[PDB]
Amino acid sequence: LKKNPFVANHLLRKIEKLNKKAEKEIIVTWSRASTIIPTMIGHTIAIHNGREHLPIYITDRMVGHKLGEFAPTLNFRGHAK
Amino acid sequence: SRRGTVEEKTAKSDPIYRNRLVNMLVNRILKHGKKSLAYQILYRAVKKIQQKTETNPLSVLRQAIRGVTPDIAVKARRVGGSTHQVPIEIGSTQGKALAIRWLLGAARKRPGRNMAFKLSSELVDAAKGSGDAVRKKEETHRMAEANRAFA
Amino acid sequence: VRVGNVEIPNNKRVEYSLQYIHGIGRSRARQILCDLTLENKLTKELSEDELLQVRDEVTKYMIEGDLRRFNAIAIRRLKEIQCYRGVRHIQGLPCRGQRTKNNCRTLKRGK
Amino acid sequence: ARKSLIQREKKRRNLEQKYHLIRRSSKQEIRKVTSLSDKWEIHGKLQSPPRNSAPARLHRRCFLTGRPRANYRDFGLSGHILREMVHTCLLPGATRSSW
Amino acid sequence: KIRIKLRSYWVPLIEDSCKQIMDAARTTNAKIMGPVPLPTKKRIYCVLKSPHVHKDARFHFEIRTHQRLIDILYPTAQTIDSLMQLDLPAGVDVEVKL
Amino acid sequence: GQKINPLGFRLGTTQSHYSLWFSQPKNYAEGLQEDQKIRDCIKNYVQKNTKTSSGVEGIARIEIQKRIDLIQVIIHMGFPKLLIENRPQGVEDLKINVQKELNCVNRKLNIAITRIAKPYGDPNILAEFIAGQLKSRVSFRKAMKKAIELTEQADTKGIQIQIAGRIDGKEIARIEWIREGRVPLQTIRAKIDYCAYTVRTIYGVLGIKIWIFMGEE
Amino acid sequence: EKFVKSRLPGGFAAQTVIGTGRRKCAIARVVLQEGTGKFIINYRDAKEYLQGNPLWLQYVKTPLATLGYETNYDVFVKAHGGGLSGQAQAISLGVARALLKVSASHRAPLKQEGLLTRDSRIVERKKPGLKKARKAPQFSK
Amino acid sequence: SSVKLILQGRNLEVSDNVRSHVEDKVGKSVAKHSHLVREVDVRLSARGGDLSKGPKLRRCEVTLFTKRHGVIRAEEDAESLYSSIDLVSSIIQRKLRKIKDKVSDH
Amino acid sequence: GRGDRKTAKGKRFNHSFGNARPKNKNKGRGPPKAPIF
RNA sequence: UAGUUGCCAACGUUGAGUUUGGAACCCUGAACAGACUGCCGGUGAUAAGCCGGAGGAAGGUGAGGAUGACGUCAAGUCAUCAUGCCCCUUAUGCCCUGGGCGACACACGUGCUACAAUGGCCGGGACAAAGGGUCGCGAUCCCGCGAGGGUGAGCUAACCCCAAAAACCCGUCCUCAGUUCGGAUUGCAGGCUGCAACUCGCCUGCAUGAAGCCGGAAUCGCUAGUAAUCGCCGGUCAGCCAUACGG
Ligand SMILES: [Mg+2]
Ligand SMILES: [Mg+2]
Ligand SMILES: [Mg+2]
Ligand SMILES: [Mg+2]
Ligand SMILES: [Mg+2]
Ligand SMILES: [Mg+2]
Ligand SMILES: [Mg+2]
Ligand SMILES: [Mg+2]
Ligand SMILES: [Mg+2]
Ligand SMILES: [Mg+2]
Numbered sequence A: 001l002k003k004n005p006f007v008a009n010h011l012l013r014k015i016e017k018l019n020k021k022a023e024k025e026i027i028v029t030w031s032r033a034s035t036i037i038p039t040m041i042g043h044t045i046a047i048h049n050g051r052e053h054l055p056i057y058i059t060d061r062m063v064g065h066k067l068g069e070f071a072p073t074l075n076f077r078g079h080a081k
Numbered sequence B: 001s002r003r004g005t006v007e008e009k010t011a012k013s014d015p016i017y018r019n020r021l022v023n024m025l026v027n028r029i030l031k032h033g034k035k036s037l038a039y040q041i042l043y044r045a046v047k048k049i050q051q052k053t054e055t056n057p058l059s060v061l062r063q064a065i066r067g068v069t070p071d072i073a074v075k076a077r078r079v080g081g082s083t084h085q086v087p088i089e090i091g092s093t094q095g096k097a098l099a100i101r102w103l104l105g106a107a108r109k110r111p112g113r114n115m116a117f118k119l120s121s122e123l124v125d126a127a128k129g130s131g132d133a134v135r136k137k138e139e140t141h142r143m144a145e146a147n148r149a150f151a
Numbered sequence C: 001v002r003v004g005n006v007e008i009p010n011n012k013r014v015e016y017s018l019q020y021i022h023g024i025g026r027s028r029a030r031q032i033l034c035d036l037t038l039e040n041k042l043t044k045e046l047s048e049d050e051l052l053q054v055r056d057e058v059t060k061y062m063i064e065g066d067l068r069r070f071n072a073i074a075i076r077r078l079k080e081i082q083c084y085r086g087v088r089h090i091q092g093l094p095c096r097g098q099r100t101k102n103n104c105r106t107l108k109r110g111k
Numbered sequence D: 001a002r003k004s005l006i007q008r009e010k011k012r013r014n015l016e017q018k019y020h021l022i023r024r025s026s027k028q029e030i031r032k033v034t035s036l037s038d039k040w041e042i043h044g045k046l047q048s049p050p051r052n053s054a055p056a057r058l059h060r061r062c063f064l065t066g067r068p069r070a071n072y073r074d075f076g077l078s079g080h081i082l083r084e085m086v087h088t089c090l091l092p093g094a095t096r097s098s099w
Numbered sequence E: 001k002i003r004i005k006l007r008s009y010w011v012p013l014i015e016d017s018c019k020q021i022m023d024a025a026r027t028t029n030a031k032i033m034g035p036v037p038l039p040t041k042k043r044i045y046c047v048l049k050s051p052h053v054h055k056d057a058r059f060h061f062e063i064r065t066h067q068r069l070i071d072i073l074y075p076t077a078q079t080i081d082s083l084m085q086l087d088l089p090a091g092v093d094v095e096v097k098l
Numbered sequence F: 001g002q003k004i005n006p007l008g009f010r011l012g013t014t015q016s017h018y019s020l021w022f023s024q025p026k027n028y029a030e031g032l033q034e035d036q037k038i039r040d041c042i043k044n045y046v047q048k049n050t051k052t053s054s055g056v057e058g059i060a061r062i063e064i065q066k067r068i069d070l071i072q073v074i075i076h077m078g079f080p081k082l083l084i085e086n087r088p089q090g091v092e093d094l095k096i097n098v099q100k101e102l103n104c105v106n107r108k109l110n111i112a113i114t115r116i117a118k119p120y121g122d123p124n125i126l127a128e129f130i131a132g133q134l135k136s137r138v139s140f141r142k143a144m145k146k147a148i149e150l151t152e153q154a155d156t157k158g159i160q161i162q163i164a165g166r167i168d169g170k171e172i173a174r175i176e177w178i179r180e181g182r183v184p185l186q187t188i189r190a191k192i193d194y195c196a197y198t199v200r201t202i203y204g205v206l207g208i209k210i211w212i213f214m215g216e217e
Numbered sequence G: 001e002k003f004v005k006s007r008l009p010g011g012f013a014a015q016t017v018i019g020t021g022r023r024k025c026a027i028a029r030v031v032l033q034e035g036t037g038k039f040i041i042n043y044r045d046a047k048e049y050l051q052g053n054p055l056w057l058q059y060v061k062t063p064l065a066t067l068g069y070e071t072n073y074d075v076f077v078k079a080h081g082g083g084l085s086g087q088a089q090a091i092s093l094g095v096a097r098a099l100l101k102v103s104a105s106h107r108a109p110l111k112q113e114g115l116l117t118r119d120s121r122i123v124e125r126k127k128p129g130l131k132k133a134r135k136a137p138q139f140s141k
Numbered sequence H: 001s002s003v004k005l006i007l008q009g010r011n012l013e014v015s016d017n018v019r020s021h022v023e024d025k026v027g028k029s030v031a032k033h034s035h036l037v038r039e040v041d042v043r044l045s046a047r048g049g050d051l052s053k054g055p056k057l058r059r060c061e062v063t064l065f066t067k068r069h070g071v072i073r074a075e076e077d078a079e080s081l082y083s084s085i086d087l088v089s090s091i092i093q094r095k096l097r098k099i100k101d102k103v104s105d106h
Numbered sequence I: 001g002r003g004d005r006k007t008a009k010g011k012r013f014n015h016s017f018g019n020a021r022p023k024n025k026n027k028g029r030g031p032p033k034a035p036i037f
Numbered sequence J: 001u002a003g004u005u006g007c008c009a010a011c012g013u014u015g016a017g018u019u020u021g022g023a024a025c026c027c028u029g030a031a032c033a034g035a036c037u038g039c040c041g042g043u044g045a046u047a048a049g050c051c052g053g054a055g056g057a058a059g060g061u062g063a064g065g066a067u068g069a070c071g072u073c074a075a076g077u078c079a080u081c082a083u084g085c086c087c088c089u090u091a092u093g094c095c096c097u098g099g100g101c102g103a104c105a106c107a108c109g110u111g112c113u114a115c116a117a118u119g120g121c122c123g124g125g126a127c128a129a130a131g132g133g134u135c136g137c138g139a140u141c142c143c144g145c146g147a148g149g150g151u152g153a154g155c156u157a158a159c160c161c162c163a164a165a166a167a168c169c170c171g172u173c174c175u176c177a178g179u180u181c182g183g184a185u186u187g188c189a190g191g192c193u194g195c196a197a198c199u200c201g202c203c204u205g206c207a208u209g210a211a212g213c214c215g216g217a218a219u220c221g222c223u224a225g226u227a228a229u230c231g232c233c234g235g236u237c238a239g240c241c242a243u244a245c246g247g
């Protein structure tokens, strides 16, 4: 609490840029360690795993957590298959 | 070893009773390298034996070693023939330490509140014929007389 | 039901007998006595007014009920939202950076 | 221990000293100002310098071989090559040990 | 009251220089408290022999630092000229004032 | 099957360090950098000034001796006159060669080149005299035999020579050595000099380990 | 306490009878003196400093148990390092050394009983590749 | 029977037809003294031909630990993979029979 | 024992600090124990 | 022999800092001596040596270590480095972001913590060594239950700090119970390092309290301050997955 959460500038600008318009402008990102401020609520964001970007819709119960928790990059279904 | 000449260790005695038998009895109690705790196990026991028997605990301890000491054992050999177990005698020093292992061994196994109580009831019972260590003497002594013939 | 909808033994001390309650650990058991500044006597020998004074103060914390519900909803929060940590609960696997190659017999056994 | 990596580290050495003093000013600026009041700006332009100028991103290598492991800050060389220098009479006071 | 500390790695080298501090100062009228050797430090270092798995094979080495302490009293102009004029060996690192 | 380097085995009593200086542990590493930058540029200097002969192309030993505001360097050779006396500015250009990387006006340095008593008594030039023949592929045993016959003039008591690698161009390497006199490695009291040298052949590379027993002491 | 400082005017340095023993990284600066048969360590009682361990009280006394002088002298000592066993048994040598200066005639009972023999055995060093000085690690063949 | 098995692709991949050939051979040599051993170690290797310089050669290293302080070390080399497995199995059956002859010496 | 981090035996093994293994006397021992007559 | 940054004593503001006397104690580091079957007995081929007194701190190699012959395994490393030949030069090279090296039915090993009463929790009191440290180690004091956050005395270190050594002694309680044994797993709330802590760091405060009652066939270490057992330090290091490694 002594410091603010981590939110990159390249992401913060794009999020703040769209609040003026208030419309879907589906966007790609790369920083998985970014915290979800409630200003990016109702938007849809694509998070870069090892391979590609994963568009995910933002829910009100995602605020305190970061983006990377929802973007898996291990890709394991079953064993010996 | 292959030398056959093992040095004779300096058998020490305790401060109070000033006998070497007691110090040999203590060295088998500890297992983590601490001696101050064994006397709290011992000095509470011999005091407890005196509390029950109304006599010196030294004679009761000297009698227990005198009764449990088998002075004979059986060892396996196959230098001639297969699966032979003929008897073999025991010296004075060997039989002395050999009885301490059986007493403290049975004391740890039997139930009780603490090692001082487990040790007290062992020596008092062992001196009076009936003792778990005395049973092992009978079992070991049985195998000797059973295989009395050298075969 | 001695206190808090649980039958506690009557032979143990007070400090090390409230701990059987699902919401009372080792520190909370001491904080209650220290707030009431009473002596840690036996469980059965305790007076009625003093034991009454415990029954009113223990209910202030998340003792039982809402405690187990406050947790289960929290684990349910991660499952429906599909966090990384939420999927591992569904898989019956840990979520705090453990290695899963040769350990974790607790959760693998608790399938 | 490729040649490009050794020059790649020299790149980070120069960028650090280039952007050294302003970071101390920013580490003191971020410690004084109240949260949610210019703090995102302070931490904001804390990201704008090159990440290659960070001290934590450094990695000590051997002065000769450029090896990324077994380094010693008192010597600056890797353990293997440093061993040979002890034997062939180049280091003062570095004698074999037995205690 | 000029307290001088000097440190070095070599025993026959530092003893020679310590003799020169006395020789340069004994000619001048000034008393000297004798040299008091402080406890010597020893920087142990461990390294592997091979560049491969051979772990039990290790090579320890040390760097022994022999330090000495000498102090003068009642300094003079003739004294200070005698100390600076004196030449030292290579392996000595004098510390003239603390 | 690995023998310790005898130099490291006798640093305490018999053998001395060829770099006499001192600094704090924080600056101990920087001093070694200054030493190597000196020791390396001498080789780059002597290599280029000389026509790459089988003689005085290399040197014997370098000794650095530092002091506050002085760095006393002492190069050791068997025949300094081949590449020092021929050029009067050659000895001077060496100082400019070092002074660029050394420091500004402060911390100057003087350097001397002392003649060793026996130019072949040491193993340094004795290895290079051999290596000059292996590059010209004179023969294997002749260079090993001629070296032993040469050091008798240098009044040596014992010597041992070892060569490893590819010799006859075969697809397999070999290790051949020879000993003369007495060369006790396990005797700390004795004085033994040691040197290792590499020879870049058109195929592969060779290695030359030499031991020279000079005095029981 | 002020009591020990009253008997010693300048400390254990400016005294005649002295004993200096050492065992297992411990030091014992012993000073004998005519007294009433007491035994104090570092301005603190023996049983308070030794925690009532009977043997550690024995070792400091067996130099004095011989010759029947357990009542004539009062023994004041010091300690620098090591544990209570080393400090106690180092004092056993120190108390022995000081009795020699009282009279060199009775050196033999102290020697024949084996008290002046400084037990020079020290904790062994840990070797590389081993868990202890001799404990080798386990490995499956 | 009731004995485990360990293969190892040292320098190549372990196929299925090969694995069937392994179990067939040591299954014969070990089935005799099956009540003395618990496991079977195997390590296949390949060298030469197109992989490395020199003649193509395939090694088969086989170690065996019995139930009573028994150790066996077997290593052979052949031009083919199956031929290497065959020769080693003959060596195990030779030494494995040597043990019983010593235990049953009476 | 040593695995129980919340005890002084565990803090010493893990080299951490808290109510169990304090740094000095003035640190927090928030819950004390009651007397026993 | 030398006497401080250490040792002995006097003084007390005080035990954070000072002053005075002593070199007689102890330690620190130079230089020497001391241990060689040297002396006596027995035995011995009139030998080597062997068994024993004595003396001495130590006696038969005083204890420990470095130390590793000719050679063996075409043993190991081309990824410390250096290297012959071969191979890729709009890629087998060059720079960055993110991910991965931390995934997981299982199997094979090395270790850690335990199954408790020779024990466990709390309170009080004691006793070490070797190391590390000026962009550093950080005292005292003030905040927070706490991790930590402010002030920054001293210490280039025989001065100061890291730094509380723990086992152990005294006293209260727990009385053989999956327990006041055991501390895995998970949630919540916080702190520090750092541009960055989701995958993937270390810690605090609480609450949860798995398996496990000394362990098959088999199998390892250790012959003295050893094994067993207790804790401390360091290196790499912003930080640390270190229960490791070296002391
Ligand atoms: Mg509870
Ligand atoms: Mg780093
Ligand atoms: Mg050889
Ligand atoms: Mg030591
Ligand atoms: Mg290991
Ligand atoms: Mg191994
Ligand atoms: Mg517990
Ligand atoms: Mg930890
Ligand atoms: Mg507080
Ligand atoms: Mg090979």
Ligand SMILES: [Mg+2]
Residues within 6 Å of the ligand: none
């Ligand atoms: Mg290989």
Ligand SMILES: [Mg+2]
Residues within 6 Å of the ligand: J078
């Ligand atoms: Mg290479």
Ligand SMILES: [Mg+2]
Residues within 6 Å of the ligand: J078
């Ligand atoms: Mg290459």
Ligand SMILES: [Mg+2]
Residues within 6 Å of the ligand: none
């Ligand atoms: Mg590639």
Ligand SMILES: [Mg+2]
Residues within 6 Å of the ligand: none
């Ligand atoms: Mg790995």
Ligand SMILES: [Mg+2]
Residues within 6 Å of the ligand: J102, J103
């Ligand atoms: Mg992973």
Ligand SMILES: [Mg+2]
Residues within 6 Å of the ligand: none
């Ligand atoms: Mg169970």
Ligand SMILES: [Mg+2]
Residues within 6 Å of the ligand: J213
């Ligand atoms: Mg039980």
Ligand SMILES: [Mg+2]
Residues within 6 Å of the ligand: J215
């Ligand atoms: Mg087990």
Ligand SMILES: [Mg+2]
Residues within 6 Å of the ligand: none
């Ligand atoms: Mg042995």
